Amino acid sequence: LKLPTAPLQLSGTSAQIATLLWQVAAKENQLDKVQDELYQFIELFKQHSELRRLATDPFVPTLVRTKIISSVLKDSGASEITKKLFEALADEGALSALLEVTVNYEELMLAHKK
């Protein structure tokens, strides 16, 4: 329950998600391992029109969206923090918040190197 302090305070509902992501990535020494995963998922939304359909189309059900996101990341060589984050953002249709969670994570990260 003891979480490391973020280097700077930030805004609400898309910056505190990135603050929590930084707080749980600094506990696993896993900051630069999930930052490039954020950038990779940005490139994945750039690539496929069927993966950014899960972020913008409001007619896909939340069951179908969570089952695409969970059955696409079958450990994927990836961090478990990223997989437990994106199935959490897929449970609300909040996948469009990734492109600002990346901004606030960049802000925390370049504040992490002073």
Binding site: D36, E37, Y39, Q40, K67, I68, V72, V103, E106
Partner: protein, 383 residues
Amino acid sequence: ADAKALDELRKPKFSSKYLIQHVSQKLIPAVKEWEKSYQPPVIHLGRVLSVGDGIARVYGLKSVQAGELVCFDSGVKGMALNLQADHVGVVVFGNDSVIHQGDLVYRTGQIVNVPIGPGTLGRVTDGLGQPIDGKGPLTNVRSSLVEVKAPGIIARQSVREPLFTGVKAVDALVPIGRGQRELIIGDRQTGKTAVAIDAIIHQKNCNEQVPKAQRVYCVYVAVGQKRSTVAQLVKLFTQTGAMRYTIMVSATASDAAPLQFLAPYSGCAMAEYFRDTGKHGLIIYDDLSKQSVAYRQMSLLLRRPPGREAFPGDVFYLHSRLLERAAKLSKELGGGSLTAFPVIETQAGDVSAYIATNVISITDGQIFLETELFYKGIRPALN
């Protein structure tokens, strides 16, 4: 959080590719496992996000115009009113129980229009143009928009011709003109429909006596009234012969709120045919204070912010752009006229109500019907 690093993220900076080549060949076999749960995507058609209380929020419909007729897949028509960034707010011309989430919405290409012409002369019509008298579809008629701008300064001329109403209190003290908007205002059951009806009956009595160009074609718009009253009025106009010159537009209380909102514009568009073709028209908007109530409901369910007595802010423009279409045109436009008789019901004689003061400020004349003059034997109860 600002847009400059948010646009810098459009440039790729991933520096590793141990998920990109893994899930890109894993995405399409995952999506194909759920393709019967996917609905097909939509761009120029529409799809209902949410429907309720006569409002459909429609996803898609990329190239709809504001105020455009749309048609749902269940056959019921609509009207794209507020075009927001992620959805279109569509009011439903009918009962919205046949609309579901995920129903396809089809853009019809037309702004809302009614059939105008001599074929409407004698029919009982709904607020959208379809005949409800059970005498078949409309023949010898053409489609015209319900949002025609009123004729300007150079198109009009001065109101000179009388258009008598047959009520000698009116024709002696409050003399109407043939292109004049005259408001009949009073409490409930003070004789406003009686004055408008006797005006229509007197146009029937005068149309069989004048040479073909001072003849007056009445249009009665029944907004929010019950259907028994409209049927009794059709029986009256047929048993006196006034239905040969009268059109009746009837959006009753059972109809949807956009139908009652749109029925004075339908009646004005049907009556503008006679004004634009050199003839002389008479339009009665009975219960304009019910068309304002239908507009209030329609705009409150579109989540527009309410104002005085929870009316929209633009409820003045609603009646001003309707009543300004009653004009007397110039000789180069035919010389035809259209005279309006809007009706407003007041509450306990309160003339200082919102819709009452707006329509008093819009129209030319006033006909006040007091309920204490009515019970003193003075019929019509002209104040």
